[PDB]
């Protein structure tokens, strides 16, 4: 039989995508500093429209203690611990998981959160004033008092 795991189970770590399909991670580095083992390493990169994303994202799973502090620290719900535990390996170097081994094609456990719908910083598809609870930018040369 397959082993039942509850939805909260702290197993293999993945990076998720927002509902529009773009990757959720903005490379804010909060997960890496919140890691007590220090087994996350990433670098911020930026697209032409200004969107922050990770240039690389690597996790040393030979070091990781599956404590969930990174997922708790993630302000975009990009990094998530998933109910999977079959991560055994032949060589310890193969336990270093790059971004192509972590970025799944869906939203994971948090199905609808989009951090970029909250951020004031403008990207493609969201100019100034289009975030949540944001008024449109009043130009300083406006006639109104």
């Amino acid at each position: 039989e397959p082993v039942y795991l509850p939805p909260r189970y702290r197993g293999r770590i993945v990076l998720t995508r927002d509902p529009d399909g773009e990757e959720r991670c903005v490379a804010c580095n909060l997960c890496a500093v919140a890691c007590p083992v220090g087994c996350i390493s990433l670098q911020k990169a930026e697209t032409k429209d200004g969107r922050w994303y990770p240039e690389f994202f690597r996790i040393n799973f030979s070091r990781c203690i599956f404590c969930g502090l990174c997922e708790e620290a993630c302000p975009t719900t990009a990094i998530q611990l998933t109910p999977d535990f079959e991560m055994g390996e032949y060589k310890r170097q193969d336990l270093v998981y790059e971004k192509e081994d972590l970025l799944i094609s869906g939203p994971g456990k948090y199905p609808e959160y989009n951090f970029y719908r909250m951020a004031g910083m403008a990207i493609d598809g969201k100019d100034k004033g289009e975030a949540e609870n944001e008024a449109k930018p009043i130009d300083v040369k406006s006639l109104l008092p």
Binding site: L5, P6, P7, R8, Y9, R10, L30, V33, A34, C35, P36, I65, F66, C67, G68, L69, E72, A73, P75, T77, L81, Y113, F115, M118
Partner: protein, 576 residues
Amino acid sequence: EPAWQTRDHLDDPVIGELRNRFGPDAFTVQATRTGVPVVWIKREQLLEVGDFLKKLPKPYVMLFDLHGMDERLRTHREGLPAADFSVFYHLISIDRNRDIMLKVALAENDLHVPTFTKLFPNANWYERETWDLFGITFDGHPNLRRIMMPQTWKGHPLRKDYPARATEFSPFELTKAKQDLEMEALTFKPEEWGMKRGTNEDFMFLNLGHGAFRIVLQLDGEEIVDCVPDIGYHHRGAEKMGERQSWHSYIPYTDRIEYLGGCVNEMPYVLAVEKLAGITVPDRVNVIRVMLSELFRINSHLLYISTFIQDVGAAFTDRQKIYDLVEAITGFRMHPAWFRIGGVAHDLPRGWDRLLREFLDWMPKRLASYEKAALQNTILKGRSQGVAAYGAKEALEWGTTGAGLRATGIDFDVRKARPYSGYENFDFEIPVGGGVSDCYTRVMLKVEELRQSLRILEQCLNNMPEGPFKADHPLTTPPPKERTLQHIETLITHFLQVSWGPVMPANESFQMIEATKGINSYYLTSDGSTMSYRTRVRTPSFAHLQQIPAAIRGSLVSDLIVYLGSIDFVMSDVDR
């Protein structure tokens, strides 16, 4: 007047007694958040003060803790005597239900203190650990050698100038240590262990093997004449790690000390940090923490009792059900890392009531099964009664807590004497024994504690309060996640708490709890920073392991094996 307020405890009668005995200028009272009167004594008056406290009308009978502190990098020492190092002595009066911390200030060039072993014999191992990790000499100590590190170790790792992180691996030192293990028996000098009369031509010296540890046995035939348990094979640098992690990111390390306990080990650390932060948690947090701590207490007690039955010759499904419930709540079975500063990591999952109801409705028949298998078994009873028995005097003088102390008849449980996490809102009994603490009485007390923990779990299930699972404090770490993901100031607070760390104002906090094997305490010194200046963990298994030579003196090796099984201990708890 909250429970975390800074108090000097000048209205404690022990302060007036010390003032009337030694004079008003002989000591300095420090105001702390430890909940304990802390007094600074001159080094030359330490033995006099200890002897005076030993002879009070309701005397201070137990040396709870003894350790050191490197005070050189401490920048907030206002109202404190000038010190480069210090040694603290935590002493407990049980008849008074009080405790006092004595502090001796030491200069860097003169790191010697009078030995406390003439007043409390558990000071032997406590002073050996202080010498090992701080380099503080204790004059008059019989065998002042290293107890955590090997004897060929350079430096004292708990000093502030000692690098915490692991040094480079050398194959040559590994072969050297293997060579030292090769003719360790051939070059065995029974003077380097505190033993005597080495080869009467009838004394045999052996090494032996809850964790793996060595004990050197002196045998006259089959009788034990002396023994020295060699510990430190499971030393993980947990306190030094407490200085290298933030207040938030240290919580998994609290888990891995006493790894059968989990959330039980989380509880004193987060309670002490909440004292430092000035956090009063809401009631739902208290009940959640009590429920998880009692589930893990049941798990640890079941493993201990099932191991004791198998060792004598007189278990998994119950622990699997507990692990399934804990896995549903926290996402992890063994090391949940789930308590937080100000609360718990998440709310209870929807469906926890069903799982806890299924666990509680399936357990009492197993309780009857264990009581029949243990209390009514004659082979277990004849194997386990009278072997390694001690009274109240031996449990008080050796710092024995938990089931052994209550088996001596001293009704001392932390959940009733000094309540924490809302344990005063539960109706449960504290089982005590007669005057004799042998293996059978300790195991019987653990079975009765299993029943009482099931009662506490029933009360946790019946009226679980509705409310927040995290406190409304600004220093609740992390903040609630939905407000973090929606609100900018909560995002700011979360950003700073999970990266640099939360800023605990400079103070000292203390919290002792009734753990699964005795009293576990966290003593935390904050220097105003986002990490601990000093994380001292008092564990029961250290003190219980020290009592072994004083209890099986004159017994057999099989009696020693039964005694080792009967002590609820694990080696990670001893060495931390």
